[PDB]
Structure formats: C-alpha cells, structure tokens
C-alpha cells in the first residue's frame, strides 16, 4: 500500500505554494509546487541522510520522529513546528546569522534548488533544519490528465 | 421521455483507429457538451450543442432526432450500453472521403486542419446513421491548471473518506 500523504498550501517569501509529504517507513519524500508557474521541486530522504541532518544541524531527531514533526507543520497542528523555503543564497545568509559571522559560485542547478526549511522551536531556541529540494521542471500535460482521469474515477466508483 | 439529466457527466477511454481517447459528454442546462482528449499527446478538442443545432443536425443528416433523445443516445454509446449506438472519431479529410464513396478541391484552413468529429452511429432495422459532431480543437491544457484540479480533487477524495 502507498504511504502516507499530507498536502497544503501556503506562502513562502511572496508567494503560494502546495507543500507534498509522502512517508513511509524508510522512506520521505517532499514534494513542492509553485501554485502559479507550475515550477516543481522534490526530494526523497531515508533514514541515514535525516539522521545525520539532523545531527549537522545540532540537534539530531530519529527518522520517524523528525517525519511526524514535519508532518505536524504542514498541517499546522503544532505551534513547535514551522515551515519555510529557502533559495542556497537565503541558506547561507541564515547560517551566517545563526553563526553571528559577517559573510562573504552557484550552477545553473544549484542557483534553482530550493530548501525546505523545518523550524522546530525548544524553549526559547529555534532550529532550521534545511531539507534540499532539485528543481524538476515542470509537469507533463498527459501525464497529469492520467492522473486527473484516475481521480475522478475513484470519486465515481465511491459514489456509487 | 429520454434524456441525460442536467449536471450529469459521463467519462471513458475509447480507442478509435488504434489510439486511446479519453470521452466526455456532459449535460449543462440546454447544452450537450463534448471534450475529447487524446490519452497520450493531451491534445484536447470540444464542442457545444443546443436542442436547435442538434435537432437540425439530425434533420440534415437523414433522420430527426428530438434533442433530449439525441442526448441520451450519446450518453448511452459512451456508456458502451446499447447496441443500437457506436461512435467513431473522425478528421474533416476522413469524412470528406467517407462522403463520397457512399455515391474535388477542398476547404483548407488551421481550424479545419486541426477540427475533429465524433461520429454517433445509430443503427435501425440494418441501415446506420452518421450523425457528425465537431469539435474545434483547443491545444493541450495549462500545467498550473491541472496541478490545481487534481489538488481540489484530492482534498475531495480526502474529505470521503469520513463517510
């Protein structure tokens, strides 16, 4: 059987977008569109890569803890949690004002990833914790009328 | 009296000459409307109908048909659920050629080029009456769009599943 999916909207420095979780037991993948261009970014994560993020970041979470955090943030059913999405440049401004460094080149790949930010919140403190996300283009007409057809077809079956 | 009832949509894939066509004719209020997508290319082509166009349509054609009627015969051969209907899905070129074998420069435009005819074949006793709907073609859809109809659909999807 498919993993679990939470979906939402919500806007991100100036503008909207759909925020995909997929999880399953080894396994999360985020998925993130821009509602107006169709631009679509997306990452899969197992459970080393988490971890050590995690660790990096200065606070290590198990896997399927730092999957249920993430999960409560797109549905905004924790105040502990946030979300935010971040270009390389914005990251590296955010290390350094969480480092208290001044601060001082980027591929054609690079400069269009984007970073979902998850913003876990102990005491006082704030932690980002920075998922990366290649860009994907955009999406293919066919096969999103495939998967239109294919929902219709469920809400009809269920219907009945 | 026969009819499709307003706010009903009927939806299956059908393939005509080897290709997989996604079929949907739905009813609006005095309005039969008919969008064909191709499965593989989402090339996507539509019309729309009202009782007086329809009802000169099948006079013109060899036999008149009352427009709720001709709407349910639609209905029906999408459904694949009579055997007195069957469709097929034609260019201008493809009926101009159908037309003159049955007993010359033609027209020649984009819109014509690009048009397609979902043909309602109606049998009675043994003849079979072609009945001709165009359908301007339209080009393929909008990405951000369909991104949007399928997240409103999921959250439908969602919201059944507390039922």
Same mark, same amino acid.
């Given at each position: 059987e498919v993993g679990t999916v939470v979906q939402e909207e919500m806007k991100f420095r100036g503008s909207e977008f759909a925020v995909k979780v997929e999880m399953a037991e080894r396994l999360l993948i985020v998925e993130i569109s821009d509602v107006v261009t169709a631009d679509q970014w997306r990452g899969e994560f197992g459970p080393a890569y988490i971890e050590d993020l995690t660790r990096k970041t200065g606070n290590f979470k198990q896997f399927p803890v730092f999957c249920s955090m993430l999960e409560s943030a797109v549905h905004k059913?924790?105040?502990?949690?946030? /979300?935010?999405? /971040?270009t390389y440049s914005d990251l590296e401004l955010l !290390?350094? !004002?969480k480092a208290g460094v001044v601060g001082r080149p980027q591929s054609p790949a690079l400069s269009a990833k984007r970073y979902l930010i998850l913003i876990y919140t102990v005491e006082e403190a704030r932690i980002?914790? *920075?998922?990366? /996300? *290649?860009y994907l283009g &955009? *999406?293919? *007409?066919?096969?999103?009328? &495939?998967?239109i057809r294919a929902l219709r077809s469920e809400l009809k079956t269920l219907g009945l």
């Open positions: 059913s924790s105040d502990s949690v946030t /979300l935010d999405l /971040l !290390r350094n !004002r980002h914790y *920075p998922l990366p /996300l *290649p &955009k *999406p293919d *007409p066919a096969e999103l009328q &495939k998967e």
